């Protein structure tokens, strides 16, 4: 995309830690960038928009080509985040609304470096990467997520020089679902036969979509939360057309470059129903904040080792929380993302292993030591209604079957023209975020 000049960018300053040892820690003056997809597209020499509500304009865009010539994306001024975005700093917290009222549904946003002209890229092996989260106002389906994911540190300017703004413009994303959502791929308009997502006023669907290597630290809302690995081969931003795409509505979800289900580690769904939940007698309690820390372990304990373990604990109310275990006759009691637990408990649910087929921890590591980029968003789900993270999934299958039953939110729920009314103050708060040594966030 070209970058237009109606309104200078301002990302949102956002200070983190990086830590030596525990309580060692100094600031690193980072920000927040808004995703380009959020961004107004208009003509670049003039007003006129080249894309309102799911649709582009066909004299304006009838090639991608053409419509990467004739448009740019603008930027979001200091006092836009709030007022139209629903983003917002106080200090070390960052907080993302839901719905902000011309109406704006949801958000995904960056972390930019110090210099605010690339994407901070975290080299997550042998390291902890801890933050702080209320999603206490997120309730069935809804979800305030954290991840990491293999964008280039420009958001692909040097790759595709029709792309002039770059990270500074949130530009570049790319995930494991290799999405057809997003609006400018490889420096280009995704204008080719796009189409209207039914019931979603904002968004389509073009012709490519955008895979990549994706770490998700943090799916959740109060009611269930997962962490989940997704490789790719490769893992670097690819952008896909046809069976590489691995779309769903062609059949393909497990004929594509990336393993679109992940490697899930979700308390709920490995059968601890009462470890996380609305209330002071749930272990860790989702109606208050809490720390959640992500250790990213090794096989020889250094930065050269292959990824060989996701580990997780929790503190609130400076009270240690280890994570939940595996509970299923038969089956190791796991309490973390292994290559073993991912093949134990894939067979035990009867998911095809295409984390395995990926490459593995081994294959999710060579993303993690490339540097991937730091995600944070609040979003419903107008494909499955979030039923995947906190309900029955298949809706239509048997709860006490292993790995159907996520959450207790009902099959009914999180329909997103109910939850867009319903949960529109709904706010996710990621804050305090540090990162280290193992052993150094806390």
Not at 135 to 158: E, P
Not at 241 to 263: A, P, Q
Request: aromatic share 10%; glycine share 10%.
């Amino acid at each position: 995309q070209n970058v237009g000049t109606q309104a200078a960018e301002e990302p949102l300053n956002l200070p983190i830690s990086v830590c030596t040892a525990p309580g060692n820690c100094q600031t690193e003056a980072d920000a927040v960038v808004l995703d380009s997809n959020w961004r107004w597209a208009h003509t670049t020499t003039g007003y006129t928009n080249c894309y309102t509500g799911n649709l582009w304009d066909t004299t304006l865009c009838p090639t991608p080509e053409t419509c990467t010539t004739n448009c740019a994306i603008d930027g979001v001024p200091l006092a836009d985040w709030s007022g139209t975005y629903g983003g917002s700093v106080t200090g070390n917290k960052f907080n993302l609304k839901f719905v902000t009222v011309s109406t704006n549904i949801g958000a995904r946003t960056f972390l930019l470096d110090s210099t605010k002209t690339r994407y901070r890229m975290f080299q997550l092996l042998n390291r902890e990467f801890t933050y702080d989260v209320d999603v206490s106002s997120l309730d069935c389906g809804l979800n305030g997520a954290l991840y990491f994911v293999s964008m280039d540190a420009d958001g692909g300017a040097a790759k595709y020089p029709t792309n002039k703004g770059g990270a500074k413009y949130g530009t570049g994303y790319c995930d494991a679902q290799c999405p057809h959502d997003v609006k400018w791929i490889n420096g280009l308009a995704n204008s080719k036969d796009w189409t209207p997502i039914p019931g979603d006023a904002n968004s389509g669907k073009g012709y490519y979509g955008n895979c990549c290597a994706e770490l998700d630290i943090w799916e959740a809302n109060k009611q269930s939360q997962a962490f989940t690995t997704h490789p790719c081969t490769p893992n670097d931003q690819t952008r896909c057309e046809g069976v590489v795409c691995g779309d769903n509505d062609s059949g393909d979800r497990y004929n594509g470059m990336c393993d679109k289900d992940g490697c899930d580690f979700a308390s709920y769904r490995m059968n601890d129903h009462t470890f996380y939940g609305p209330g002071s007698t749930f272990k860790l309690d989702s109606t208050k904040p809490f720390t959640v820390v992500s250790q990213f372990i090794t096989t020889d304990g250094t930065d050269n080792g292959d990824f060989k373990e996701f580990r997780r604990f929790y503190v609130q109310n400076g009270v240690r929380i280890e994570n939940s275990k595996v509970n299923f006759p038969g089956i190791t009691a796991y309490d973390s993302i292994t290559d073993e637990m991912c093949a134990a408990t894939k067979g035990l649910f009867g998911d095809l292993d295409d984390h395995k087929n990926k490459g593995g921890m081994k294959q999710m590591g060579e993303a993690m030591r490339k540097g991937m980029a730091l995600v944070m968003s609040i979003w419903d789900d107008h494909d499955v209604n979030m039923l995947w993270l906190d309900s029955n999934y298949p809706p239509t299958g048997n709860p006490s079957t292993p790995g159907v039953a996520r959450g207790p939110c009902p099959t009914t729920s999180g329909v997103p023209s109910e939850v867009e009314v319903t949960q529109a103050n709904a706010v996710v708060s990621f804050g305090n975020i540090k990162f280290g040594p193992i052993g150094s966030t806390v």
